[PDB]
Design an enzyme around this catalytic site. Structure first.
Site, short mmCIF file in Angstrom:
data_model
loop_
_atom_site.label_atom_id
_atom_site.label_comp_id
_atom_site.label_asym_id
_atom_site.label_seq_id
_atom_site.Cartn_x
_atom_site.Cartn_y
_atom_site.Cartn_z
N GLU A 172 -49.94 -54.78 11.52
CA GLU A 172 -49.41 -55.20 12.81
C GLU A 172 -48.84 -53.97 13.51
OE1 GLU A 172 -45.82 -56.99 14.65
OE2 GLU A 172 -47.28 -55.60 15.53
N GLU A 215 -49.67 -47.66 20.18
CA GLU A 215 -48.86 -47.30 19.01
C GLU A 215 -49.71 -46.73 17.88
OE1 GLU A 215 -46.37 -50.41 17.59
OE2 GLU A 215 -45.13 -50.49 19.41
#
Ligand SMILES: Nc1ncnc2c1ncn2[C@@H]1O[C@H](CSCC[C@H](N)C(=O)O)[C@@H](O)[C@H]1O
Ligand SMILES: Nc1ncnc2c1ncn2[C@@H]1O[C@H](CSCC[C@H](N)C(=O)O)[C@@H](O)[C@H]1O
Lengths: 662, 651
Positions: A427, A436
């Site tokens: 995740e 990210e």
């Protein structure tokens, strides 16, 4: 009681069994004894009170003060972290000094992790140059703002470097002033001094001309040693007239906390005079956000806990998992290997287990159970500190906790005898999806999975939509950096440095405003307006990337304006299919109801670009990749009906203003 | 929602131009309030100026700003009155002369909104494009330290603009107008720089066409302008718009008296509102350089004892001089401000005549502050009975303008041009200006002053000073030094500090309530003296070397600053540590900071070296420190504020 706060300092004299584990009942009972907060060693008591005087193989205990054992707001209110006493960056032994630096760093990083409001550091020398340097750079480069108590020695003579034959003009004050200077005179609001009082009161603490100094210093605390008597009454635990006159003299504001220090091995009234000391003491003085960067920065426990408060993300993840264990489990398997990639505090761990169980009770009814072996891979060491505690208490030592950057498993896997996974679960998502560094992270893990290995998430995709808001734009533009923030690291390629005054500075050669404009942001879209009725796809990623398709990208995303208006930039979104039918999304049209996990991204334009009914807007966006990181370059191309076409400057050339690293 | 929740204002208009009104706003707003609406929009020049109309040649000019401040205590002003620029001003007139005139008066008006110390203020856009206006405005808000809301009032529709031309008005609309003006003032924070819609009787396209109307949700929408072009009732589409765009209850709404020559039933006033609702350091002040806002005077006039003692020296001078035998004396009050020192002179003649005697007193109150003159005219009328001749001038050119206006030589000249460090407001230079026409007999109140300096230790004050930071909205506030704002590569105002920000912070004097600190000495020392009248015109330039000895391990961060001044003979006042006039708040202490905190110990010799230098256009301090140990070693800190680069008190 209320107005006066009195802390208890953990000492080698209340080290009980597993106290690191049971800080809860600790501050509980201690609290019963009518004192609110505490000064607990942030490394844990097994680490703080360790002693280095041994062979060259006597290594220091790992940090072991787990955060989960107590809700973060409590850590923040009660606990005050002190650095392990054995640390001494200014040791006379170069190697121990180095060791000290390294470990001081570890303890600092951990103070950040637990997210503590206040922290104590006790000086043991007349001069602590190296410590000063380490601390200076730390505080001056942290985005955080915790308070710092610098506890001093009782007197000049207790100092390690005290030579009674060369203290020309030294006293406790000179010590404090020298340290304070040596860390660059950070704000008293944050860098504060703590005096240590004891049986003997030096002259400088009685001779008025000198005690007055501490009124002009950022004094935050007195550390009072239990060196004292029981004069009068039922043996009143009281204090000298000089002592009193001191705690009364400098007790200006009721902010100043008072820590008590147990020197005497008096288990006391068998643990029931602590309150007597306490009493004695009291009665004598009366919106923009940067995108997270989990890969290159270690997320504090606050970030993680908040993450957890979004339970829906985890529920969906669970559903995805059960679905996977269903498509694989229908095969009649027995055991299956799973890897959680970046476990955090492990909500997806507990949830994955929950999934094996629910799957078993719904599908394997009246037949062999399918059991799952669970490897959790993680890099943030503090997080690891949490993952081990979790593993013990809740998970029953079932799971293998591997500390590493997953992009390195391919090496330590076959070595340490770990078998290939059937499912890898991660995740690592930004509001802009891959902002990210997810693709590079997961791509690191491909060299060790089976072609069989189903990866979750499977797919995710970055979307975008033109918006108008003079508020969001005017707000992004006007971000400024105050003196106290002058050395906080840039989000670009450059890092802080020492200026001509040996002071840390973060320079911005491209210019400050510019630097503001060439970054992605995550915002709660307040006073904006959509210029497009619906969004458009920007960047897709699919895992496992078995074919090693390049992670970098390039695109034009065109829209059409239906009114006179100022285009200030775009809102960036993302959705993701965890596995097949199961997926969650942040996109306006397909938004997971109730989910607060992600606020939208924003790709700002330098200047509010004007438009009107008709013009076609081509948002050029490239995701470029580099040995050391990844970044987005972007710009706009407006074209009117008559074919006439203009374009804005390329923002973020070479990630100079905004550059996600690894 | 609830009554008090939804705010309603009353715009003034020629519809309600009563007599003497500019001298009676209190009752005006009181009636307004009795009609159930909190605030009021009102022209700052005053109605007489506001609705003037240019028609003749240069023979007839605009009425002077004449909306006096004193008629209402300053907090009332700050609360209720919203200032508005005279509609006749047009910085973008087609006629060059009228546009110049417009720029000058637009400025005077802005300056006045500052003076009264209003919170909000509104300016009406009358063109599709107002570049000159936007430039004047731009420079104003970027170089003003004064944070204060602003409403850009839009026209009823694109059609009624002065530069309206149905032939070139391709793709333009009220929002295009607003976006052009907002862009032309640099996109100042919409927290301050906002826009007001004027809702006409005929509702435009873009305010009903939902997709368009939504534009204002992404704009700093401030207030709704509502014309009486309605019946009290309100149309369906009007209702839907007012509801639609009304997000925050923070929005304001003003009534615009258009069609009704008056309201049939007076109550038809009260109706409308109703039907709508149914919807710490500081710089040394510098009065010669910057005109003071009225609240500075309003708090300046709380220091009862300064005026008391001034009046004491006045009765004293009336004794000494009046005792002669004469029956009259002339006195120049040099810098009357709002004039309480004037009323103190007249109260001192009035009160002298019965304990010591006649001796009539003629008063000449000079003043540079063009906005204060409004207050001294209203003051001369309401209290002074026109017995005092007000002179709006630089008191430094008074000797010249002495014959043309028939001015008489002064027997006395009263003034207060000192700061928290005494000479720091540049009193000597201006009084030396008045010197050239004084009778040899002229006593200067005050006669003398001298500054004082006292070594101190406070990490808090030092860190605070060093960490001074300029955020983006404050990027163009002028320096305290020789420097001034300039246009950057984006035609955006910026104040550059080529010496460096920190240096600019440490090479300045401050005034602070000493908060968390310690004195490193027990008594102050004499720095720079001055004496008036400076009959010989001696050089105001000075250069001294104060001395102090240290008695403990300490971090010296700089000196606290003070002053004493004799008004006349015995009586006088002083801010100094021991000699300090009690009860005063007139002057918090100066701080002459050192760049880095200087370490000291028992027996250290400290020489503060201060050169008060003077220039053709200003004055400045150049200070530093020499430290000398018992052994005779002598370090020396660097010359701070060289050539007033960080600090230069202009004239
Ligand atoms: N390259 C990498 N290798 C190992 N862990 C990584 C990593 N990049 C990010 N992480 C970890 O992945 C986490 C992302 S936040 C996710 C935490 C948890 N899965 C939750 O949803 O609550 C961080 O805790 C970070 O430590
Ligand atoms: N050169 C000059 N010519 C005319 N007035 C001056 C002047 N220099 C300063 N002043 C005036 O002198 C005043 C000094 S402050 C004194 C204000 C007033 N007397 C009071 O006590 O309330 C300022 O208001 C300023 O307007």
């Amino acid at each position: 009681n209320s107005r006066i706060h009195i802390g208890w300092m953990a000492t080698t004299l209340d080290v009980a069994e597993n106290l690191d584990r049971h800080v809860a009942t600790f501050c509980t009972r201690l609290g019963e004894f009518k004192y609110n907060f505490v000064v607990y060693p942030i490394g844990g008591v097994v680490r703080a009170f360790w002693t280095p005087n041994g062979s060259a193989e006597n290594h220091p205990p790992v940090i072991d003060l787990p955060d989960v054992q107590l809700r973060n707001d409590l850590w923040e209110s009660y606990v005050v972290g002190k650095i392990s006493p054995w640390i001494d960056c200014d040791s006379s032994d170069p190697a121990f000094a180095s060791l000290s630096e390294e470990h001081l760093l570890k303890e600092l990083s951990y103070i950040c992790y637990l997210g503590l409001q206040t922290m104590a550091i006790e000086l043991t020398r007349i001069s602590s140059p190296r410590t000063a340097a380490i601390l200076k750079k730390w505080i001056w480069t942290r985005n955080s703002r915790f308070t710092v108590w610098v506890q001093l020695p009782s007197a000049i003579e207790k100092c390690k470097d005290y030579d009674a034959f060369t203290i020309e003009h030294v006293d406790l004050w000179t010590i404090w002033a020298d340290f304070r200077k040596n860390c660059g005179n950070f704000s008293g609001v944050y860098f504060q001094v703590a005096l240590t009082i004891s049986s003997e009161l030096p002259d400088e603490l009685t001779e008025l001309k000198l005690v007055d100094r501490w009124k002009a210093e950022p004094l935050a605390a007195f550390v009072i040693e239990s060196g004292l008597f029981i004069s009068g009454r039922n043996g009143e635990a009281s204090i000298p007239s000089a002592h009193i006159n001191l705690l009364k003299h400098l007790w200006t504001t009721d902010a100043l906390r008072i820590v008590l220090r147990a020197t005497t091995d008096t288990f006391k009234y068998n643990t029931s005079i602590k309150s007597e000391y306490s009493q004695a003491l009291r009665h004598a003085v009366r919106v923009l956000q940067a995108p997270l960067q989990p890969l290159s920065e270690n997320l504090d426990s606050g970030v993680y806990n908040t993450f957890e408060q979004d339970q829906i993300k985890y529920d969906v993840y669970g559903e995805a998992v059960v679905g996977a264990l269903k498509d694989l489990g229908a095969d009649g398997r027995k055991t299956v290997v799973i890897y959680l990639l970046g476990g955090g505090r492990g909500p997806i761990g507990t949830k994955i287990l929950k999934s094996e169980r629910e799957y078993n009770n719904t599908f394997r009814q009246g037949q062999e159970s399918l059991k799952v072996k669970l490897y959790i891979v993680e890099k943030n060491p503090n997080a690891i500190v949490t993952l081990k505690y979790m593993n013990v208490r809740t998970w029953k030592r079932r799971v293998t906790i591997i500390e590493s950057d997953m992009r390195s498993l391919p090496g330590i896997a076959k070595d340490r005898g770990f078998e290939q996974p059937d499912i890898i679960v991660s995740e690592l998502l930004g509001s802009f999806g891959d902002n990210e560094l997810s693709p590079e992270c997961l791509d690191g893990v491909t060299g060790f999975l089976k072609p069989t290995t189903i990866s979750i998430p499977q797919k995710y995709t970055s979307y975008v939509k033109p918006i108008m808001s003079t508020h969001i734009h005017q707000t992004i533009k006007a971000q400024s950096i105050p003196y106290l923030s002058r050395a906080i690291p840039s989000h670009g390629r450059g890092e802080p440095e020492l200026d001509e005054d040996e002071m840390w500075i973060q320079k911005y050669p491209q210019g400050h405003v510019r630097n503001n404009m060439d970054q992605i942001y995550v915002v709660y879209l307040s006073k904006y307006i959509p210029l497009a009725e619906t969004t458009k796809p920007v960047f897709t990623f699919e895992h496992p990337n078995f074919m090693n398709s390049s992670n970098e990208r390039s695109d034009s995303i065109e829209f059409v304006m239906d009114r006179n208006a100022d285009l200030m930039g775009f809102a960036g979104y993302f959705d993701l299919q965890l596995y097949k039918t199961v997926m969650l999304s942040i996109e306006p049209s397909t938004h997971t109801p109730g989910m607060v996990s992600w606020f939208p991204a924003v790709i700002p334009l330098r200047d509010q670009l004007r438009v009107g009914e008709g013009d076609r807007i081509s948002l050029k966006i490239d995701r470029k990749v580099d040995n050391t990181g990844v970044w987005y370059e972007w710009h706009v191309e407006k074209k009117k009906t008559n074919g006439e076409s203009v374009s804005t400057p390329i923002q973020n050339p070479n990630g100079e203003s905004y550059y996600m690293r690894m």
